[PDB]
Amino acid sequence: KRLLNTWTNRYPDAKMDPMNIWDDIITNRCFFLSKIEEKLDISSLIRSCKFSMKMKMIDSARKQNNFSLAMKLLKELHKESKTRDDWLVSWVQSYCRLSHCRSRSQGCSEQVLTVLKTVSLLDENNVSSYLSKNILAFRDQNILLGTTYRIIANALSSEPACLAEIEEDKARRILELSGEDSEKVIAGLYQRAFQHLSEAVQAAEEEAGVIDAYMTLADFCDQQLRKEEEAYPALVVEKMLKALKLNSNEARLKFPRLLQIIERYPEETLSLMTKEISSVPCWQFISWISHMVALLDKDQAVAVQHSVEEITDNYPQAIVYPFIISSESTSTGHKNKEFVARIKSKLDQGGVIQDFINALDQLSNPELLFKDWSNDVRAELAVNKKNIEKMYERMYAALGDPKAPGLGAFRRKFIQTFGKEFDKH
C-alpha cells in the first residue's frame, strides 16, 4: 500500500480534475496514514509520502493555474522542508516554478519583489545538495536561475522605470550585482541567464529535459536576435539542430528560423551546415519541402541540397513536384544546376510524371491559356519579339500545332482545328 498510495494513489487526473477531488484524495491519504500508524522509520516513511503527495498537489494546482495555491500548505512544506536537504530543495524548486508561473501580468514588479525568492532561496545552502544530489535538480536550478534572470531583464527592457526599480532596496544592489547602468545591468543579466542556460544544457546532456534546455536556449537566442534588430548564433543553432535530431514538432518549427539565421549570418552556418546530415538524418521537412526546394536554385547552404538529394533517394515521391516547380524557376550556381541535373536524373522515369501532367493538361480549356497570354503579350509589350516569340512558340506547341500527346479528343481535335487559327494571324 505504501507503494500504491504513491503518486496521489496513481495521479487521479493530473493537470485536470480540479483540486477539490485532489484535496479529498489527500485528506483520505493522510487520514489513513494517521489511522495505520496510530494502531501499529515507518512514521518517517509516511511523512515522506505526505511530502510527495503535497508536492504533487501544489504542482498540479499550479498546472491548473490555481495561483490561489495551498499557499498555507506551501508554507507548511516550507517549514518541514528543512527536515532533509532533498525534500528542502524539492520544495525550493516547486516554489521557484510557482513564482515563475506567478509571473503572469505584473510579473515585472511582483517578481522583483521576490527575485527568485532571494534567488534560488540562496541555494548555496546546498547546491544540488552540494552536488551530492543528482545533476537533474542541478540543471533544474540552473533553469530557474536563467529563467528569473531573463524575466527580470525583459521586465527592465520593457519597463525601464519599474516601481520596484524605483523602489530603492537591497534588490537594487543585487540587481546591479547580477547585472552600473540600466542597459549594462540588463546586459549582465542576459549574460548570466545565458550562462545558466548553458549550464543546464550541459548538465542535461550528461546521462527529455535535454530538448527542453535546447528549446529554452533557442528562445533566448531568438530574443537576442530580435532585440539586436528592430557569438550566440553558431552555438544556438547547432544546439537546436541537435534538438531536432531528437525529433520534436516544435524543433521542426524552428526550421524557418534556421533558414533566416543562415541568410543573415551564413558565415558560421557554413561551419554548421557541415553538420546537417551528421546532425540530423531524420527524414523530415516534408512540410518544409518548399523552403529548401526554392533554395535548391540557390547555394546558401549546399548541404541542404545534399540533404534533399538523400531524401529523394529515400523518397522518390512527394519531392518530384516541388522539384519541378523549382526547376520552373555562376562559379557556384553551376553547382546548383548540377544539383538539379542530379535530381532530375534521380527521377525514376520522370517521363511518367511528365506524361501524367500532360494528360491532366489536355483536359484544361486552352482558351484560358490563350486569354492569359493575350494579357502576357501586353505585359511584354510595354523585350518585344524576342520573348514574345518564345511564348509564340509556347502558345504554338499548345495550340498552333495540330498534334499533341494524350489520347483525348476535344482538345486533341481543337489543336488541329485551330492551329490554322493560330498561324493565319
UniProtKB/Swiss-Prot annotation:
Autophosphorylated at two clusters, the T2609 cluster and the S2056 cluster. Autophosphorylation induces a conformational change that leads to remodeling of the DNA-PK complex, requisite for efficient end processing and DNA repair. The modification N6-acetyllysine is found at K56, K75, K403, K420, K424. It is found in: Nucleus; Nucleus, Nucleolus; Cytoplasm, Cytosol. DNA-PK is a heterotrimer of PRKDC and the Ku dimer (composed of XRCC6/Ku70 and XRCC5/Ku86). Formation of this complex may be promoted by interaction with ILF3. Component of the core long-range non-homologous end joining (NHEJ) complex (also named DNA-PK complex) composed of PRKDC, LIG4, XRCC4, XRCC6/Ku70, XRCC5/Ku86 and NHEJ1/XLF. Additional component of the NHEJ complex includes PAXX. Following autophosphorylation, PRKDC dissociates from DNA. Interacts with DNA-PKcs-interacting protein (KIP) with the region upstream the kinase domain. Serine/threonine-protein kinase that acts as a molecular sensor for DNA damage. Involved in DNA non-homologous end joining (NHEJ) required for double-strand break (DSB) repair and V(D)J recombination. Must be bound to DNA to express its catalytic properties. Promotes processing of hairpin DNA structures in V(D)J recombination by activation of the hairpin endonuclease artemis (DCLRE1C). Recruited by XRCC5 and XRCC6 to DNA ends and is required to (1) protect and align broken ends of DNA, thereby preventing their degradation, (2) and sequester the DSB for repair by NHEJ. It is linked to Immunodeficiency 26 with or without neurologic abnormalities: A form of severe combined immunodeficiency characterized by reduced or absent T and B cells, recurrent candidiasis, and lower respiratory tract infections. Some patients show dysmorphic features, severe growth failure, microcephaly, seizures, and impaired neurological functions. Belongs to the PI3/PI4-kinase family. This is DNA-dependent protein kinase catalytic subunit. It comes from Homo sapiens.
